[PDB]
Design a protein around this ligand. Structure first.
Ligand SMILES: Nc1ncnc2c1ncn2[C@@H]1O[C@H](COP(=O)(O)OP(=O)(O)O)[C@@H](O)[C@H]1O
Ligand SMILES: Nc1ncnc2c1ncn2[C@@H]1O[C@H](COP(=O)(O)OP(=O)(O)O)[C@@H](O)[C@H]1O
Ligand SMILES: Nc1ncnc2c1ncn2[C@@H]1O[C@H](COP(=O)(O)OP(=O)(O)O)[C@@H](O)[C@H]1O
Ligand SMILES: Nc1ncnc2c1ncn2[C@@H]1O[C@H](COP(=O)(O)OP(=O)(O)O)[C@@H](O)[C@H]1O
Ligand SMILES: [Mg+2]
Ligand SMILES: [Mg+2]
Ligand SMILES: [Mg+2]
Ligand SMILES: [Mg+2]
Ligand SMILES: [Sr+2]
Ligand SMILES: [Sr+2]
Lengths: 425, 412, 425, 412
């Protein structure tokens, strides 16, 4: 009817890292604990976290205990030992919650029988039972009346009205796309989806370069696909307009080198953070993105690419794993209050159709990703298909999903040599 | 917890006077009696009314001929005054109500004892608590006599009402004409290709419902944020295009319109929950509470494929079909119409929907949306609402106006 | 090697509700219990249930304990507390049985080694081992010789011979179908299967109406699809011949109302019980059907419809769940000793064939339902398909499975307006 | 538990006289000896018989040339009288039998210790107990010499028998002619579309088997009740149509015929189990006991798809194929022919059966039933039995008569 070993880890994980506390607070409340010992500890830490926030210590906790007189400590240290990982922490919180809910239900049953054996009004008992089951149901996210939501929406309209910006939110750097898309707003998820070799990795690089150079803003990229050196080397080729194949092959002119050196200096000026760790769990990416957001102030985060990410617990069907990863990414974007852009790859059936450009259906094949991506961009290169079209050297960016406006298409220039996207005229 | 003597006196009093029996029949029924012998005598006495009204001891014998005469005569000796009787009838009912509660208590303990996801346990616990609260009896079967009378009263109400529609109106006159309306306990499915304006059509329905019918509604938006959704509706009301809103391109004339729309919308009662992925069980639990607390007469879910079952099924279609069944069960339980939106992979037809996991079989009403201008020609400003399935019978089509910029539906 | 917590619940569940005892008796025997304490309790209750049957109390049990002197009681009350649900009861009985069987096997092994170390005849030991494993195997349903079965069959033939009935068993109300089908016999499962909108819900209503009116017999319907009000409202339309669409729309003439009122009076005369609970588990339906059979005496039960029912434990493939539900329904029909009729829906592929009528294969698509349904009926409306056939207003009932006779087809009249089936001429 | 000296004397006695060795060879074999040295000397001595019959010490040396001579001479000194020898041979065998039992005991403990469904544990426990009981030795391998002699004896029995059929006859002469018959340890599959009379054909087989061959049979009827099935057979015997039986339409002349058929059927030994859904493991356990207790020489299962494996498999075909393998294993273990009926989704052919989960590969014999009148013409009263697969080789077809009303099969 209860599990202590579980509660032990919940309290312990809260002791070692304070940040863990809120996470537990979302999952649990003081009274899912069977032990009064634990309910007190849950209470004091819950209060302590708000007052001291992140910098909560063990000596500081001890001093607070002494002032209260609540304390009489080795046990606390033992609990600290018992600390468990964030993923396991979520797991043990869940099992604690289920036991608690089970206890609560059985208790209601016991009471109703007792009340029933005694003589009381039927209406009173059932209404209270309704209230009690409602309370158990509440213990999480609730319903919102339109009046409260309306007030926040109006405030958002005010901020848009009061802005001096041609494009609200972070600009992409590509004028026609940037105008019709209205930009990248804080807390939304953007999806750049294209077939392999369509230049989405390059497009990401163009975006982050344009952001750092023109807007003077820092960005972060998790590159699961290519190493940080390859990413930077490609970027230098984009800046200096020295062909990438020559750089990698090792054939360069002294004049070409000086151009590359200068490009390196200018790039060093810009603030850009790279993580090339090959396969990250959503939990891993979340942790890294959190701290990177705190230490460095990043207004944009790119993940390349989506399919390379994996859930903390693997499932058998592929689609559920993707859909889960997507759902987390959107959750992260909101949490960080910055735009998050995830890249995605398209399956073979895209090119089996006579149109040869991407469609919404092609993305579905990967899962129910679309449901919460606030903007969806496709990349297409007809040229990719063959030599012949006299068109070539051009690439088209399709705007499959917008919250603001209708479906539209934007044509831009793409130079295969330097792997650089540029505005047409 | 029942009394043989307290109710036993009810039977005696019924034997003595045949005018006593309708009085007890009003207060209590056969199920409330603890003893089979009392229930049986209660049964025959109630049935005695139809087919001699006042023969007080020889129809008793007559009933015995087709079916303890000394014993009932002993019961005859035990009887009480009519003022006495109402009191003892009340105590018989409460003891019966007591049993129902105790039974519920035992069941609730059992549920806790079982092994299920706690959400499931909470969901199943709510259903039993609500059913017993409504019925006052553990048993859910109803004799047709009781149902028939209630139906007749309902028929009176339908006749005496000025139609329009006996069910909840969409706000669109012609569609509302072909459909009886949205009745309590049925599932309505709005299915269309992406960008056909089904999300907007839902907003139009709930808005028209709130303003004209003064009725509360609930929307579960799995796709777009509660904030995102609301701006939409404000855009529909004030007729200011979303692109202008966001761009910062708007003017003061635009604003005040948006503010007024915000005030007007705040007047209406509409509840929103945006949870990115809901299980059907979560949704019923939440809708369960929302129906009790705020009394919402309509529920919209956007959209269907975003929902998932408590236990995952294979591969897809069965999982989606499972969701449909759950929503239907929700509509039945909450006794309100529930509308779920669905996405589709010339016009659209039923076959296209079947590829999506065969929802058509569990649905009481199916609506499609089609916008010929979206495919792109010929002069047009219109979008058509198709009815694939109606419990009544015929498939029919309703045109309506659609404004691309405001994403607003209107009667022609 | 054993589980007490399990045995605790088995005894407890028997204490609170006597009816639970036989269920346990089917699953378990006195000696699957590791505790002598439990074996005594199992023994006394097993004996007690037969003598007192359903009305077995706690004071009465205590008095019996005292007369025996077996008793010396708080523990018994604690056991009563420990009572578990019917579904869980089945689950814990299973785990008790497995431990018991495991113990039994290991014991045989121990003995054989002991016997082996000692000097005994090989033939004697192995034969006894064969006997012992046979006993474990027995502890459930056995083989029946044809001689015993023949005697019961002959008795059934006698009852058919000695009957004054044109149709033995419950009549359907439709003369041609009723004659060739020979009727609905006690303890068999009938399946009415048709595509959505083919009028099976209406056909059920016709059957139950005809039963109550003509034969003066009570019936029960579990309507998972439509509410009790909708079901009754439709039925009133069938009786009064007032079109259903007018009733629901609210357009009626005072003359039409009086007809409806009279129909309500006549319907109130008939005994029909309705349960509109939306999704029932097989366990739920079984419990309700049991008590409804005991309190009210119902000779017919209809379930509309099959796919809406669900097993106590959900499985991943759909077909296994259906097949399980079917299997339970047949088991219920036998148990209740009354005919049980379940309605089933047919998938899209029925109308993808040029014949456009249902076939046995169409039903298979839903699972191995057919294996035990004692009669299978299909409904077909060619008219449903289009206006044109000059035929219309007619519906055909196909007799796919019969135990008595060959495959046959019966044509009947169907009025779309009133949603009523009627005999043709 | 063996004795070096007790058996050691057996070896000595074999050294002394070459007429002693066939006496011990009759009682015991090489496996019964505890020591490798004894087994090896036993081996060479047994093989010494074929290729000098009576050289008592120099073939010993001869065997040593191609392969402890002082030691065996010590064994030579230890020997005993021929009456003595039979006794010590008996004790060697029993100690050996002892070991087999103890080994079985250890294994049985292990099985209990493992984690499986208890039915599985009981099934696996039975198989080991039966094999050791039959073999008297833990090991199941047999040298071909022993098998060859048994085969030869069997060949004698086949030759000296008046055929007809060396295997179990169906009752239908021409079919029985083309098939050797139903032999012990093989799987026969009767596959046909619904209503082709495969259930009836089975009843005809088991009836003809019981009446003429005086042999017991077992049927697992998963589809129809034991009562339902039996009436059928009574209908077949008395030639009274089922529709008349049930309708109450029958006459006294009909009855007595049914009663006589009931008496005649009661004379025959036939065992029925109707369990709606059986696992294959349950079926073997039950058939295991039924074969031992009542000694049934034939088993029929109606029908195949209704069976299910101990562990569920995906999606379907593999699950069904698994069932086939299990039944084959059952036929092998019980050493009797096992016949399973199957349903099919011009004539019917092997391809149609393969769609059903590829049973053809595990089956020793495959029979199809076809009734051209059922499809409906031309004058006809006949149904054909097709052989798709025979271990011998050729596919062939056998006509037979079929009476629609009695559902009865007969020779033309
Ligand atoms: N190292 C390289 N050398 C030469 N051309 C390249 C190189 N990398 C990419 N390209 C060209 O430019 C495009 C770059 O796209 P890429 O970076 O592969 O995006 P994605 O990750 O979507 O495949 C490719 O289509 C290819 O034609
Ligand atoms: N500013 C605009 N100009 C033109 N069309 C627009 C504008 N804003 C929205 N739309 C159109 O309105 C439609 C909204 O449909 P929506 O309700 O989102 O459909 P669904 O519910 O299927 O997602 C989109 O198809 C979009 O093309
Ligand atoms: N409320 C109604 N109003 C008008 N016609 C109806 C109504 N309900 C059913 N019908 C007609 O009569 C038939 C009733 O069948 P229905 O009750 O839907 O059985 P099922 O459950 O098999 O679909 C339908 O085919 C339809 O044409
Ligand atoms: N009274 C009857 N009149 C005509 N045909 C009948 C009668 N009774 C049974 N039959 C036929 O006999 C056949 C019985 O076949 P059956 O052994 O059940 O086949 P299966 O084993 O494939 O189920 C059915 O096809 C049925 O049509
Ligand atoms: Mg890439
Ligand atoms: Mg939408
Ligand atoms: Mg229906
Ligand atoms: Mg059959
Ligand atoms: Sr109290
Ligand atoms: Sr001993």
């Amino acid at each position: 009817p209860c599990d202590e070993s579980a509660e032990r880890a919940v309290l312990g994980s809260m002791l070692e890292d304070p940040e863990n506390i809120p996470l537990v607070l979302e999952y649990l409340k003081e009274e899912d604990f069977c032990i009064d010992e634990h309910k007190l500890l849950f209470r004091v830490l819950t209060n302590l976290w708000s007052e001291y926030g992140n910098k909560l210590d063990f000596v500081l906790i001890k001093d607070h205990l002494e002032k209260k007189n609540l304390l009489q400590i080795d046990w606390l240290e033992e609990l600290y030992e018992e600390a468990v990982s964030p993923d396991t922490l979520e797991e043990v919180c869940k099992i604690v919650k289920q036991r608690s809910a089970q206890r609560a239900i059985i208790q209601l049953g016991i009471e109703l029988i007792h009340k029933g054996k005694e003589n009381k009004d039927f209406h009173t008992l059932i209404e209270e039972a309704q209230s009690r089951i409602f309370s158990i149901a509440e213990s999480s996210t609730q319903f919102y009346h339109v009046k409260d939501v309306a007030e926040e929406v109006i405030e958002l309209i005010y901020k848009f009205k009061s802005s001096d910006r041609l494009v609200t939110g972070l600009p992409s750097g590509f004028t026609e796309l940037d105008l019709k898309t209205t930009g990248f707003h804080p807390g939304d998820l953007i999806i750049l989806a294209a077939r392999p070799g369509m230049g989405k990795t390059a497009f990401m690089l163009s975006i982050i370069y344009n952001l750092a150079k023109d807007e003077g803003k820092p960005s972060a990229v998790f590159s699961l696909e290519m190493s940080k050196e390859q990413l930077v080397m490609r970027l230098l080729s984009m800046m200096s307009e020295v062909p990438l194949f020559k750089i990698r092959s090792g054939s360069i002119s002294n004049e070409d080198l000086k151009k590359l050196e200068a490009s390196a200096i200018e790039l060093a000026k810009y603030d850009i953070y790279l993580d090339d760790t090959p396969a990250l769990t959503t939990t891993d990416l979340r942790i890294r993105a959190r701290k990177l957001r705190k230490e460095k102030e990043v207004e944009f985060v790119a993940v390349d690419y989506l399919q390379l990410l994996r859930p903390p617990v693997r499932k058998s069907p592929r689609q559920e794993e993707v859909a889960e990863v997507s759902r987390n990414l959107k959750a992260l974007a909101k949490e960080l209050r910055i735009p998050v852009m995830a890249l995605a790859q398209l399956s073979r059936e895209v090119e089996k159709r006579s149109d040869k450009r991407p469609q919404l259906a092609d993305l579905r094949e990967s899962g129910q990703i679309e449901q919460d991506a606030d903007l969806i961009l496709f990349l297409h290169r007809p040229e990719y298909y063959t030599k012949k079209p006299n068109e070539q050297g051009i690439a088209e960016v399709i705007i499959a999903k917008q919250r603001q406006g209708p479906t539209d298409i934007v044509k831009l220039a793409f130079i295969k040599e330097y792997t650089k996207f540029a505005n047409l005229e």
